[PDB]
Enzyme design. Sequence first.
Site, mmCIF file in Angstrom:
data_model
loop_
_atom_site.group_PDB
_atom_site.id
_atom_site.type_symbol
_atom_site.label_atom_id
_atom_site.label_comp_id
_atom_site.label_asym_id
_atom_site.label_seq_id
_atom_site.Cartn_x
_atom_site.Cartn_y
_atom_site.Cartn_z
ATOM 1 N N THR A 1 4.200 5.104 -5.312
ATOM 2 C CA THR A 1 3.002 4.283 -5.495
ATOM 3 C C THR A 1 3.457 2.826 -5.341
ATOM 4 O OG1 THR A 1 3.340 3.962 -7.891
ATOM 5 C CG2 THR A 1 1.974 5.858 -7.227
ATOM 6 N N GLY A 2 2.488 1.929 -5.231
ATOM 7 C CA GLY A 2 2.768 0.493 -5.242
ATOM 8 C C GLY A 2 2.529 -0.132 -3.890
ATOM 9 N N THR B 1 -2.717 4.498 -5.740
ATOM 10 C CA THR B 1 -2.419 5.705 -4.947
ATOM 11 C C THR B 1 -2.497 6.913 -5.873
ATOM 12 O OG1 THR B 1 -0.772 4.513 -3.773
ATOM 13 C CG2 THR B 1 -0.708 6.897 -3.442
ATOM 14 N N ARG C 1 -4.255 -1.786 8.984
ATOM 15 C CA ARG C 1 -3.020 -1.700 8.198
ATOM 16 C C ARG C 1 -2.807 -0.289 7.637
ATOM 17 N NH1 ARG C 1 -1.807 -0.194 2.581
ATOM 18 N NH2 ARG C 1 0.182 -1.229 1.974
ATOM 19 N N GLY D 1 3.120 -0.519 -0.546
ATOM 20 C CA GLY D 1 3.542 0.413 0.476
ATOM 21 C C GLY D 1 4.569 -0.093 1.449
ATOM 22 N N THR E 1 -4.678 7.453 -0.465
ATOM 23 C CA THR E 1 -5.022 6.098 -0.888
ATOM 24 C C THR E 1 -6.080 5.481 0.033
ATOM 25 O OG1 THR E 1 -4.063 3.966 -1.511
ATOM 26 C CG2 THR E 1 -3.249 4.841 0.536
ATOM 27 N N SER F 1 -9.213 2.745 -5.609
ATOM 28 C CA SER F 1 -8.158 2.681 -4.601
ATOM 29 C C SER F 1 -7.806 4.042 -3.978
ATOM 30 C CB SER F 1 -6.901 2.032 -5.241
ATOM 31 O OG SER F 1 -7.139 0.737 -5.821
#
Lengths: 292, 290
Positions: free
Chosen positions: B198-199, B147, B175, B201, B165, B49
């Site tokens: 992180t996570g 990320t 996107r 977005g 990322t 990722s």
Amino acid sequence: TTNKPIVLSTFNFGLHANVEAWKVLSKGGKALDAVEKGVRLVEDDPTERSVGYGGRPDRDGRVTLDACIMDENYNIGSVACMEHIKNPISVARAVMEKTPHVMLVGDGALEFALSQGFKKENLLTAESEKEWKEWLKYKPIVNIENHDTIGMIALDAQGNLSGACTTSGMAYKMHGRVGDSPIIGAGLFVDNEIGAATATGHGEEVIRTVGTHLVVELMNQGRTPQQACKEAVERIVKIVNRRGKNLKDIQVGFIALNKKGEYGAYCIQDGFNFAVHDQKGNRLETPGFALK
Amino acid sequence: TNKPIVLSTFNFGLHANVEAWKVLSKGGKALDAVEKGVRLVEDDPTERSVGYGGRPDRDGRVTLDACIMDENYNIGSVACMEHIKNPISVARAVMEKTPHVMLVGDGALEFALSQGFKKENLLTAESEKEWKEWLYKPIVNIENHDTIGMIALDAQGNLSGACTTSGMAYKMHGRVGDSPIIGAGLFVDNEIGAATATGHGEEVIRTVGTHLVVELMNQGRTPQQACKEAVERIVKIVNRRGKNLKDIQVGFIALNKKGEYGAYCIQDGFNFAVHDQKGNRLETPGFALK
């Protein structure tokens, strides 16, 4: 006392944009529909050379547009560097309502717009093409007559806030450059328990300071809308100085509206105005400015 | 002040921190340390990722997002850029070499090539195989190190950060998440502190997450307290939008001027790496979804 409905938008073309938003707000319509209808009026007009159709191109002759929208419940949509669609604010609303994402850029934003029925059009007018070829033969100077962005924020009859921001960006910018207008927290931010704010000017400086999120967080902290806009401009002044730049080269404007319908604005250089429409009528006001 | 010190996200933050410490332990600038640190992960095809082995969007295109911020409000960002293995370094060149702060798409790639970066095929045979088999349910997966964000305080007492990322696997073409957006994936104020996210977005953009964390430290919160209250704001918004918290994951790490640090996330299982003069270690923060 709540002053509602009320709508604010940037620069002197904000007066005409406000008449279209008031057609929604005066009938109890949603703030989200009112701010979309208002900025689309300016996207549609080819004589407004920094928003939508007729916007000056990047240095390669491509008109690429940036826009975002935010409603009363933290729903957001954004498109940046999108070509051939006259109404980026409406494609941003479709990103918000129809996809699980909140920002699409470039070719993917255009492919999504076409999938949602938007019509591919030639956004480079003969005037902009002529001016670009003459320029080809980059000085983003401050110019008070350049209404570089339309940002619009509104509080409706239900007491709900929403906002929209759309631009064609810095004239003769590098291909792919994105300014503050499609970035939530930089060009536009709306928190329905506090207030909303939108920005204009040199987009790079608003991104650097996360300008409109800072204005709304200062209203959260108790600042009046005008005080919040003033302190966010003063933060940019401070950073311009720490970076060894000259304030005379920079222009940034903020307008803000809180939950009770109180409003305010502030800018770096004199001559930035904004339009307010509420039940007393529509008027052009002139905020205070930092560079004296 | 506890300095130098560097924090980065997830398990792979331990190895990334060893490369940043090679700069920081010799008096090097925090900006060079965080660039060298996240490039290690961009370069690795087994990290799916970030950069080179990253999972493509739904059209099979690996498009990368990154931004960088130094100690004196200078910023650079690239989003949805193809064919360049090291987006953090093209972001640094946007910062240092152009009058702009963010370039996307084809214009970001054209600028990278003008600066000497080499076009490379970032779609590994592994990612291509997985994409054709997939041919969208962005679930919470703690094994997904989505990320790398890295923030550091150097020997001069200066802060800087980097975030990069390949974004959500099988995302729509075009996107952009939070990692290239200043104030959402990354924010650094040298008089206060720094934070990275992180996570998912979309949720960090919605709350302008890392600017909120730094402004809470400006307001006297501890780094950990600031991360915890920013996660609690996302929890509140998830509830108001009628969403379910089990479907979302967001992590924040933060560092202040004094070298104090902290972190918090929605779901248990997020971890981060800290390296200071006590050494490098993996710590596990508090989480909201109990």
